Unconditional design. Structure first.
Length: 96
């Protein structure tokens, strides 16, 4: 089902790609929680340009955002970026 909410946002996806492909294309890095989803236009309903995929844990999402972030896809450079992130606490010891 799902353990956490460590989802990832993908953009600039070729209109020739399908949920089946992506699943695997990404599966390589880490394990997917459930079938991926692609945002389509409310008009044609073929392919908008961006999709949404969630991994098992952050460890998996990290790999992608590291490599997948830019990976030249089917004549279309994809971009992986954490769907949502909450600013953590930690300024750091500084003197200035």
């Amino acid at each position: 089902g799902s353990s956490g909410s460590s989802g990832i946002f993908i953009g600039n996806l070729d209109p020739e790609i399908d949920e089946k492909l992506l699943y695997d294309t990404f599966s390589a890095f880490g394990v997917i929680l459930q079938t991926p989803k692609i945002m389509r236009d409310p008009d044609t309903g073929n392919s908008k340009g961006y999709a949404f995929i969630n991994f098992a844990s952050f460890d998996a999402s990290d790999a992608a955002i590291e490599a997948m972030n830019g990976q030249y896809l089917c004549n279309r450079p994809i971009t992986v970026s954490y769907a949502f992130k909450k600013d953590s606490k930690g300024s750091g010891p500084s003197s200035g």
